[model samples]
Target: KPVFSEVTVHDPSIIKANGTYYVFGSHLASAKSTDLMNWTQISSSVHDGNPLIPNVYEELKETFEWAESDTLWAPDVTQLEDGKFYMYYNACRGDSPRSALGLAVADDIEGPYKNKGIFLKSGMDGISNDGTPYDATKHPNVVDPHTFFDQNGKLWMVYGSYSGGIFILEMDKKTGFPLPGQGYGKKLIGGNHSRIEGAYILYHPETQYYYLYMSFGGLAADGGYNIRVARSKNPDGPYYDAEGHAMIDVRGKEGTLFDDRSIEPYGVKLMGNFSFNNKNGYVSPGHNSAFYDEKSGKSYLIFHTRFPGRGEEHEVRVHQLLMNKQGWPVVAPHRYAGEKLEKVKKSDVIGDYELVRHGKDISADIKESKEIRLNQNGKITGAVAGTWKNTGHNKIELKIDGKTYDGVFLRQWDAASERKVMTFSALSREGDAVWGSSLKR
Candidate 1:
């Protein structure tokens, strides 16, 4: 199999500038990649030599004083219409909702991003991010900020995690700040100390839908972290999942910590702790940043992943994200190695496959793939049984155990054998995702 080095960037928020893919993350971590497959670390942790922010502590003094914590939470960078890169930097109190979210400016993608002061703050009833009285139950944590421009060219920032749920505020493109008169803006989802966080939204022009992607559960190795998504026609939404559950209503119970059960039913679960036939499975792969490349018309889901046996160590992985016929994203089974979806032949997929089904619940248990054989007669045998059809345009319909899944078939890189092989990614009406990678190709 081909090999490449990976950078340890946590909560990677991705962007492209001048043909280089750059990611900025929490802890002042960052890296750059020409192709999504390989990355070279630029910086990690707060230090004077950090290229992104030299003299980090002194530069973010006010931010540190506000949150009472020195480390940053999660950050995002985007090149606004003004031809300048805007980085949304944030810091959260380790134990409380006290936090600060601010903006930084840089003429170049990699720069000494000049801090523009804290535009948003949380905690202390007298000092909410907005003018209103802060309510930990209602006010957002002021962390994990993601800024994007909608199809209509309107600027917006979606952020929040844990404490007071997810929130979004419209922005001023010229100044790169929230428009006047809007406090915390609108609450899209999460509450009651629920685990949902890391909100990233991407709008698809062809689908005419705004996809709100969020990470659920915890971020630790045993945290059962996973990625999910909801959709709405509007930017600041009423996003709904496959089950038609309104995201606004999704939250933790009255008295619970890390209550993943309360919000498990909502959002289409995209990827989770799973392994193919390979014993090296992933654990708690979450806090993702997504991008739709205008140049190549390709979409990507970028995130950090912890391995099954590797305690807290993690690294970034970029997977190809495909929008199904239903307009929902179905992640490829294999890591992206320059693969694309095309007309899949019957003979190409007639052999055995390593299949993984991602359920809606979050759990540390690694869901390993099972072997399934697709026969010439369109019958599926081994592991689970049913039928599969290549429905043209790289699309497929796989019915296993009387349940139907809508997905696509394509040629993907088989890392084990280092060859191109047939693979499929599908989702059922119930919101469970199933992926199949050819084992007998």
Candidate 2:
């Protein structure tokens, strides 16, 4: 089993190389893990102390003259077909539209990465404020670069932040750069005059759908950042939520949405500020990267999260993700454990459970759990009085107050108490999902 004791990271991008899991994050910081739970910091800053790569500020200073700080933002690393590692990095000047997305190349995962060149830039070269009031609809702040390959092995890069919407560009697979004569390629979703950023896309072959995971609202704790997702049949697409609402059209009152609870009605809310108990909770958990382990046939969600009393201190966390019958993704309440994939028997799920409903609360408060009992006679009691039936093969159908819910049952390991436990997660017709684990007395 894996336990998160020293796994602090931010804006993390994960890659598994040579049997080791490496996470690259903001500020040019990095950590590695063998079993995914325990992580050890291996590098920090572009040069000097750790010296993984050259100082980013110095490398781009001559080109963008406004580069005064060594602060390198969200970075992503991917091993291409040629067996070389490519690093996509971003540097920006505060919330200003002056930003650039650059590329670096290295032969090893822990590099000595060599800066290639600027891939895209925001604002005009040598012109800081071009008299245009920084419109995202036309010129987006090019930050948070993520490179991924589609089902057809075509290379593509997705990058953007609050300024503009999320945009994607086709890349040359041989050189690992955007295709020539192509502007920002296409705007898949977002850009409704809201704070929607940190975009990541994953193509699940089993479902044949491209899942676009994004962070809604601001990234700060008080900013009410949360993880939401939409899916499409194409990579550059009109992504839609479970309710068929286009993500690009979903927007809240610009000045008020970030501070209050208004952005909750849009996108499929995966995980937000949640707490199983006082000592165990998360706040403003967003900016994620995902991994689909072909060897284990499992999917994992990796992201940074802030704790309740910890204030602004953030750390990296991983959770196993499962797809429901409708091919929509549901996140496990707890972190990932080496759980078996066998169908959960009815006898296993018939007991007391601590159920947490992923509600519409857009604040930084934790979504606590309530006690519920599942009787073998298809009767549910306690917190949410309902009727549940085992629909065979670990599938469950529950009816509560005239509402229906569908979900799956599985067995997982509980890290806190070091015990094997029965767990289940289900989604209601209204698009809310509930995560539960069998109560251990």
Candidate 3:
């Protein structure tokens, strides 16, 4: 009957082409969906209203005439290998730290797109013929673009934000741009005073690791935006979290990365500001974008959230990104229900659940849960208490109170109640993470 629809996007960026499921955001806004839970605003594969790329921002506003904003910020498409569909836009010039990181081309994916120019620029002051002066606090705001491909197939392009942090550039696999002297091709993690920015990189070939996903704070609604991670087997150096810290020095001072808990214990915090039994929620959900279907090996976590009386309204959320047991990455307190990953038993998760506690505060409110059960002798009764065990295959082992949690136990598709439930996710030796579903007996 096609019913779940709550849409308003910002900073979203997803791609699925042909079978349809687009979602490009921030200003030139776009949307589509063939069941990624009903979304529909589509029209403007390029511009029609608010500066999605006004002729590449009027050709970089005629060579930096202080490039005064034609809007367009945070867009990232990608379909290279010459099948054509680039789109990597961002054109800020009015919030200071100037900006430009443009390029657009299209053969399809709903577009009139074709303004390919300015590949990167942020307040350049002088030298830069490789001598470097393209610095505005270490290359300031070039804006959030994210294209990927690495595992020796090369072709990379990660962007930056809040001034000088998160960058990577080495593309030119026939011309996706950058890769000829590559000056800004390094700095794999955040930089001076980092409020970090939406950056994505996934490689997960069954844990050969390369996952770097970020968004620290300040997307608004009290701005405690969450969602973080770090992993690296190399796609450009040094990322570590899960207590090994080192997201390369956690940048903070200089107006404090966006304040309120600063860099919040540096990375590995999967999601923040949650709510379940305390009633519908998500606030400050962060700027993510990930998709790794590859014909059902499953993985999805596209983001843009803010809801809970909606102040600063935002939407677009998809979740189902599990991988724990030392590989890090767990989310799915709901949303995304086409579920069928099967494998879930411990007598199919014993009984009543509704849990949720992915807390790390930031600005508070939303972290609800109470009503846990799960007995078949593995204990764990009412709210906050636990002791689950199904340590085979679907892997689980929850303890509660005395700590001990290692997770995964699945079979999802509850889209609020259409059926096929029973889910669980754990992690707490004081790192806090919990999610449970199965309340519709």
Please provide, for model 2 over 282-380, each residue's C-alpha lDDT reduced to its tens digit, 9 standing for 90 to 100.
Answer: 889999998888877788899999888788998888888887777888787777765655776777789998887776445666778788999988999
User: Candidate 1 has what TM-score?
Assistant: 0.97
Q: Is candidate 2 or candidate 3 better by lDDT?
A: 2
lDDT of 3 by residue, 1-441 (tens): 226775777878888878888888766687788878888876333343333344544444542344466566777888887787888877677556577677777788666567667767776567542467765455657778888778788888887876767878888877688877876667766655567788888877787888888887778877777877788888766887766767766665554435435566666667778666656678888888888777778888889888777688788988888777777767766777676555766677888888876754455456667778888999888876667888667867788777776778777666445666678787653455778888853
How well is each residue in 1-441 modelled by candidate 1, as lDDT tens digits?
A: 556678999999999999999999999999998889889999899778789889889888999998998789899999999789999999988788899999999998888899888998888758565666887777888999999998889999999989889999999999999999889889999888888889999987779899999999999988889999999999999999987989999888876766788888888888889877756778899999998887678889999999877899999988899878888888887778887767667777688988887887888789989999888898899998899887767888889856788988878777656777788899877777999888765
Clashing pairs in 2: none
- TM-score-based ranking: 1, 2, 3
Error in Å for residue 76 of model 3: 14
Ranking by lDDT: 1, 2, 3
RMSD per prediction, one decimal?
1.5, 2.9, 17.6
TM-score of each prediction: 0.97, 0.91, 0.37
Winner on lDDT (1 vs 3): 1
The alpha-carbon lDDT assigned to residue 375 of candidate 2 equals 93
Clashing pairs in 1: none
Residue 294 displacement (Å), model 3 = 38
